[PDB]
């Protein structure tokens, strides 16, 4: 099988700044025509692959000038000239000169925005959650960057270790942001038996770590 | 216009099988050649097999890893193409694309079919509202959202007012809990002076165990 190597893993932007990626294929691309065996996919957030480049250098419909490919034989480079917020996602290169068909690793395009503190909310359990027998809380930490946040919870001061679960959104292809849940599991009889449920978030965007709390039974 | 349904997804056992299809529209299958490409949750790009067209003799050619377990075919008097797949292993769960190389759609993948092999059994959510509150806004902000909980397999979607409200979403990605089971939660963040007169609605399907349910989501 032919091997490709895609170069970084990673890379973070600041928009109208540009962006290379390189691809080394383990095997000989070359064609008699000029071209090569070589194409570009783009995978934004929550999408399918898309085209961008093939036969190494040709631009897939409706993908502007700023995006171009180049290279010969096994050494690739993909260029973004002026790079956008719409351009954050993970790039694949990917030969189809014979089968099986080979996928370089993939690199993730960053796109570097200013810092950007979050907004922080705390949803206490429902009263239909309760009812149920069963009781979350979720911290939601809303439009941040950098994406390195931390979020501590207490109940009671007592600090909680291991009875939360974060999920982060991908990077927000139009304000470049992530969003935060840390969402704290207890038993009904465990949130009965307390009063103060806190959600300590620390990120570069705070001066110092903000705490959102409420009192079971508003108290 | 020019469409690609896929279908034939969704939960399968260990050394069970599946059967997924490749629907065209607009467009006719065999003059192109079809390719099947997976990718497991946050994972890289796996090419499967392919079907060369009718002018190519209807050739296949399969994935090594895909050891003797596939069969790629297609139903020319349906326009569909179909992989067949057998045996199924806990690391053949991914999304599953089909893949045009023609003419038409070229180099264009269909929005793919969850595959999920797995012992485990179908679990309905519960819908939880994440009501806005004094502590759930910020300002001239509020947020509020929809609780998924205890469903199984993926995926979950969420749609808020339906469809009418995209501006502020987040739908978060499931987390698999301690019981097996996912969660996740839906979130939109709104200007608090329309809490008392803007409805907010969030519209759940969990299609793996028919569950459709549209939660009104109220201050207090």
């Known amino acids: 099988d032919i091997v490709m190597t895609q170069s970084p893993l990673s890379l973070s932007v600041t928009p109208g700044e540009p962006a290379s990626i390189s691809c080394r294929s383990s095997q000989s691309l070359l064609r008699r025509d000029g071209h090569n065996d070589l194409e570009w996919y783009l995978q934004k957030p929550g999408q399918s692959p898309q085209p961008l480049i093939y036969?190494?250098?040709t631009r897939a419909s409706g993908v502007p000038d700023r995006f171009s490919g180049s290279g010969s034989g096994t050494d690739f480079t993909l260029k973004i000239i002026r790079v956008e917020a719409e351009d954050a996602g993970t790039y694949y290169c990917?030969?189809?000169?014979?089968?099986?068909?080979?996928f370089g690793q993939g690199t993730r395009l960053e796109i570097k925005r200013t810092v950007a503190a979050p907004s922080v909310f705390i949803f206490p359990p429902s009263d239909e959650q309760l009812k149920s027998g069963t009781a979350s809380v979720v911290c939601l930490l809303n439009n941040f960057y950098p994406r390195e946040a931390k979020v501590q919870w207490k109940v009671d001061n007592a600090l909680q270790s291991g009875n939360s679960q974060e999920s982060v959104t991908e990077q927000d292809s139009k304000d470049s942001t992530y969003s935060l849940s840390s969402t704290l599991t207890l038993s009904k009889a465990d949130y009965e038996k307390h009063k103060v449920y806190a959600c300590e978030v620390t990120h570069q965007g705070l001066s110092s770590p903000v705490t959102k709390s409420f009192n079971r039974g508003e108290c | 216009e020019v469409q690609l349904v896929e279908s034939g997804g969704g939960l399968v056992q260990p050394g069970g099988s599946l059967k997924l299809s490749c629907a065209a529209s607009?467009?006719?299958?065999?003059?192109?050649?079809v390719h099947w490409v997976r990718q497991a949750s946050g994972k890289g790009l796996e090419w499967v097999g392919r079907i060369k067209r009718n002018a190519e003799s209807d050739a296949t050619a399969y994935a090594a890893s895909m050891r003797g377990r596939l069969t790629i075919s297609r139903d020319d008097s349906k326009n569909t193409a179909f992989l067949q797949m057998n045996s199924l292993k806990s690391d053949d769960t991914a999304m599953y694309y089909c893949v045009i190389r023609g003419d038409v759609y070229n180099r264009q993948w269909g929005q793919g079919t969850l595959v999920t092999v797995s012992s485990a059994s179908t679990k309905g959510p519960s819908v939880f509202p994440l009501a806005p509150s004094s502590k759930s806004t910020s300002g001239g902000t509020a947020a509020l959202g929809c609780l998924v909980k205890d469903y199984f397999p993926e995926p979950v979607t969420v749609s808020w007012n339906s469809g009418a409200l995209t501006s502020g979403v987040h739908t978060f990605p499931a987390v698999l809990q301690s019981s097996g089971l996912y969660s996740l939660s839906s979130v939109v963040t709104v200007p608090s002076s329309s809490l008392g007169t803007q409805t907010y609605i969030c519209n759940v399907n969990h299609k793996p165990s028919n569950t459709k349910v549209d939660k009104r989501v109220e201050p207090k």
């Open positions: 607009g467009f006719t299958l065999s003059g192109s050649n």
């Open positions: 990917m030969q189809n000169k014979q089968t099986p068909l080979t």
């Open positions: 036969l190494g250098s």
